[PDB]
Each structure stands twice: as structure tokens, then as C-alpha cells.
Write a protein that binds this ligand. Structure first.
Ligand code: CAC
Ligand code: CAC
Ligand code: ZN
Ligand code: ZN
Ligand code: ZN
Ligand code: ZN
Lengths: 315, 315
């Protein structure tokens, strides 16, 4: 809080975070799936070793902290997160919230009940681990459904109660952040607590600048998903040129295992981006400096902006 | 079949005794009990309630229950083993899939689902070494394409292990007929299959035609009408009078906690049926005796039929 954020190894001071990737995943899965069917990923051991190798390579490239925005329904296994964080010596911030696959036991809950679930994971711990979430992740479809609106209100109330930020999954093509922002502001949530994710898939700079002008963080968090990735990277330069350097968060949205998709999509992605989570420091950062963006600006985006974002702020 | 697998290890068929073939400790979602135990008061409170309820059923003669909670109903086999030990009631655990599969299950091929069911039967559930003794499948309507994949994977896992298949369907739609067609297309003998929720049938001829084909008929939700239950119970006598006593399985389809529905539904259900899982022995058995059914027939329904069904059989 304030001076410190929760990680899966415990609280760290904001200065320790360093180069932070604010939207990543160790595993994209489903609640209970890794523990019920680890051989889907070869084995749990095989999956953890893959994640440790990849995190160590991102660390070599300068990454010091990642935010795993896998929720309960993305199969978040915070014991796996802690194992790989410790072995890679990379800070991992865990998430609460709900993505696009809530089971019935979540889909039938009230906004008050969802609020208590998010407060439990932030304030008490996830499962029986004592590991606390440092961010609340919400996904909506283009047109926000009734249940998704409940999740956003619960996220806003939990963020207002704890100071931890909210990060969203959007369809940038449907300008979904505008619906999300309206709801979140209807609860009194400051835009400076909110990242509008998957924004690098947008064909509408005006949509991005208007949100940034309101104080939202712009998650250009899927750049290596292109990947033309050069065109998506230029959105970073575009927002810098308009005076919104401080509103930019950059990430890879990479994963080391995937079960919530057609089998073998992980291999396809690995042949496309062998850098994995190292893609931002190894490719995008030098691309931007080559375009004349000063080093101090890039340090602001990769260190200072996440630190201001992740630092529990306001109420 | 000699032995059947339970949550405390293998037992001999004679040890099973009076067996309720369709029950639940908890109706939930994958990962939910471990993520949000306070939804049930606490894990300890749910466990103590389940132990008291199973001890009640045991005092009324029950020696074994089949918990047909699947992965996606939030089956927690460690909870089942704890309550089974404390109540001294055998519990048989289930694999398969019910009506709430997450994305990581919905996107699997029939061959992949077959490997998952086989893992839970032949190796164990999660990391517990507890092996499933039945395969539970649910369908809706005329069966969806994915539900057909589950039925075929269930038949293949049954054919390789001898473990039986038990289904959820809508008797009002005669949904057992579509299930039977698919399972028979795979080569599975009807004597390995229980068509469940059949006591919701308004049509005796639908059940007779299935029984005459060799299916087990799951008259498994009698006290749900108590929330007329005697009318449902008469389907038991009707099938007895038609000569199909050998095809009858009876149960309560009760639960001690429920999160996959509206909040406090468990309170409504407990006030409607305070007998819980003892409803079958304390209400339905005496009712059938007063209607003239002899002891030998009732013992055949509650002991012999579940033994033959659960005994792993390929011959
Ligand atoms: C599985 As995704 C939209 O969060 O990268
Ligand atoms: C979990 As049910 C109501 O299908 O027995
Ligand atoms: Zn997303
Ligand atoms: Zn993501
Ligand atoms: Zn059912
Ligand atoms: Zn059931």
C-alpha cells in the first residue's frame, strides 16, 4: 500500500519493481484445469520450467516485474506463480477479478457478493496461500453484458476500498473502453486507477487519445501478437507525440501454456515470437529509441508509469 | 469387477451395501470451494454438515453413496475423502463433464476428452491418487455437438476400464433416447449405462422401452418434487410391476452445499426436505412397503442393482 505493492513473494517497495510488464500470463487456462489435467501441458514440471526459462530471459533483457493478469476463470494458479517467480527472481503481481469464462458459481453472484470475493483476494489472500492480489482484472465483450457490468461495479468498489488498480480486456475495434469507463466512473472510480487493455489492436487513435486525455492508462499490451508489430509500436510514439507519455503502459500479453484455445496454439505463438516476454525490451524499446524517442521517456513508460499505476492510490 | 474404487481406496462389491447411486457433497464449480470457501460459511462448516448428513443416511441403512459431481461441478475429492472417513460411509467419485464445462474443456477433441476421463479412472484425480468409479455425462435437448463428444469419450473410457456411465437428461424431452443412440453407436452395452433424472418422466412408456433395452433407469431425484414425490415414487412400483426391477436405481440427488445456483437455494431445499439423503430410506422405502413391495425386491433395488452396475464389467 502507498509505498508497497503485493507480489507473489510478498510485498515489495515500488522502487524494487523496475522495468515492469503490466499485462502477461504464466498460463492461460481455466479454474482447476492445471491441477486436474497437468499432462495437457506435458506436465506441471515441464510448464514451470518453461516459464522459469522465459522469465529469466526477460530478466536478462532488463525486466524486473511482471503483472500476471490471469483471473480465477483463466485458471490462475498462484502457487505456480510463486514457484516460477522465486526461481526466475522476477517479481510477479497476481490478479483478482473475472475474465470472459466465469463458471455458474460466479455468473449467478450479485455485485455485493463479487465485491466480497475481490476484497478477499486483495486483503486476505488467494485460496489458502496468503498470496494477495495487486490488481483487479475485468473483461467485457464489445457490448458490455449485464453480468459484465456487475463485475465492473464490483471491481470499482474493491479498487475504491483498497487502492489497487483495475485493468481491462476490451475489443479496441469496438471501442469497448468507452463503455467500461462510463460504468467505472458511475461508481466514482478515478480514471488514473484504470488501464484499458488490448488497445494496440485499435484502428482509432482518436479513441485512444480521448481516453488518455481523461487520465486512463492505455494498454498497448499485445504488441507481439501481430507479429505488423511495427505499426502497433507506432501507437506508442503517436501518444507520446500528443503529450500523453504518462498514460502509456506497454506489455507482451505472452503466455507459457495455453489450454483455453485450440490445441497447439502455444507452439504457433512461439514460432512467431521466440523472444516471448523479452519482446518489449529487446525489440520495441530500441525501435522507439531509433525513432528518436529519448531514453528518459522510455524509462518513464516502463518504470515510472507502472509504479504510479500499481501503487495503491486514493482510497 | 471384484473391486470398486472409492475415495478411501478399493472395496469389494459385498462391502458396498445399500448404495445411493446419484448424490453430491457439494454442487459447485471447478476451483470454487478452494477460492471462496466462505461462500459456504467455511470449508470446515460444509464438511461438518456433510458428515452429519451422511451419518444420518448411515443410521437409515445407507453404506455407500456415488458422488456424481464432475470436474465442472466443482468436485473436491479431498473433501469427499475427509467426509467419507468421518462419517464411515463409502463414497465413489466421478469423472466426466456436466453442463458447465469451461473453455479449456469445451475446445477439446473427443480423443483429448477420452484421455482426461481415462486419467481420472486409471491414474487418479488431480494429485490425490483417488480414482473415479463412474463417468457422469449431462446433455440438453437433442444433445449439442460438444455434448456428443463427451458421450463418445465417456463410452470409450467405459469400454477401456469397465467403469459405468451415468447420465443427466431431460425426461420430459425423452432425452435418454438420443443418449442411448450415441452410446450404442460406440459399442457400449446398455447394461453399463444409467439414464438419470428419469423420475421427472411423465411418460412411463419412455422408461419401459429403455429398461427393456437393458438400460438402468435412474429414479434419482424423488425429494426434489418435495421442495408430488409419491407420484414419482410410483414409477418405481410401475417398473417393478412390469418386470424390470433389475433395471431400477433409486437416489435423492441431494447436496450439502450449492454455489452453482442462486444464493440460499440450499436453505430452501433443506426446509423442503429436512431428511436430506435419508429421504430414500426414511420415506420412499416405507411408502413402497405399504404399497405391497416385498423386502427381497427392495433389497434387490438398493443393494444388488448398484453392485452389478458399479462392478467394473467388460464381460
Ligand atoms: C487470452 As487473452 C485476451 O487475455 O491474451
Ligand atoms: C447437479 As443436478 C440438479 O443436475 O443433479
Ligand atoms: Zn484479454
Ligand atoms: Zn491477457
Ligand atoms: Zn443432473
Ligand atoms: Zn446430480
Amino acid at each position: 500500500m502507498g509505498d508497497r505493492i503485493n507480489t507473489v513473494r510478498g510485498p515489495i517497495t515500488i522502487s524494487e519493481a523496475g522495468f515492469t510488464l503490466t499485462h502477461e500470463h504464466i498460463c492461460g487456462s481455466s479454474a482447476g484445469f492445471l491441477r486436474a489435467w497437468p499432462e495437457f501441458f506435458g506436465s506441471r514440471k515441464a510448464l514451470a520450467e518453461k516459464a522459469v526459462r522465459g522469465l529469466r530471459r526477460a530478466r536478462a533483457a532488463g525486466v524486473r516485474t511482471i503483472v500476471d493478469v490471469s483471473t480465477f476463470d483463466l485458471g490462475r494458479d498462484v502457487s505456480l506463480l510463486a514457484e516460477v517467480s522465486r526461481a526466475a527472481d522476477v517479481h510477479i503481481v497476481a490478479a483478482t477479478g473475472l475474465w470472459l469464462d466465469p463458471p455458474l458459481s460466479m455468473r449467478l453472484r450479485s455485485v455485493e457478493e463479487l465485491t466480497q470475493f475481490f476484497l478477499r483476494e486483495i486483503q486476505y489472500g488467494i485460496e489458502d496461500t496468503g498470496i494477495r492480489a495487486g490488481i483487479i482484472k475485468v473483461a467485457t465483450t464489445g457490448k458490455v453484458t449485464p453480468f459484465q457490468e456487475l463485475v465492473l461495479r464490483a471491481a470499482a468498489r474493491a479498487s475504491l476500498a483498497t487502492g489497487v488498480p483495475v485493468t481491462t480486456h476490451t475489443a479496441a475495434s469496438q471501442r469497448g473502453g468507452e463503455q467500461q469507463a462510463a460504468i467505472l466512473e458511475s461508481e466514482g472510480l478515478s480514471p488514473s486507477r484504470v488501464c484499458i487493455g488490448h488497445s494496440d489492436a485499435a484502428d482509432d487513435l482518436s479513441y485512444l487519445t480521448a481516453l488518455a486525455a481523461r487520465g486512463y492508462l492505455i494498454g498497448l499490451d499485445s504488441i507481439p501478437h501481430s507479429a505488423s508489430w511495427q505499426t502497433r509500436a507506432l501507437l506508442i510514439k503517436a501518444l507520446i507525440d500528443q503529450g500523453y507519455t504518462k498514460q502509456i503502459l506497454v506489455s507482451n500479453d505472452w503466455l507459457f501454456g495455453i489450454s483455453s484455445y485450440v490445441t497447439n496454439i502455444m507452439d504457433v505463438m512461439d514460432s512467431g515470437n521466440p523472444d516471448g516476454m523479452a519482446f518489449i525490451p529487446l525489440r520495441v524499446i530500441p525501435f522507439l529509441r531509433e525513432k528518436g524517442i529519448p531514453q528518459e521517456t522510455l524509462a518513464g513508460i516502463t518504470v515510472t508509469n507502472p509504479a504510479r499505476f500499481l501503487s495503491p492510490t486514493l482510497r
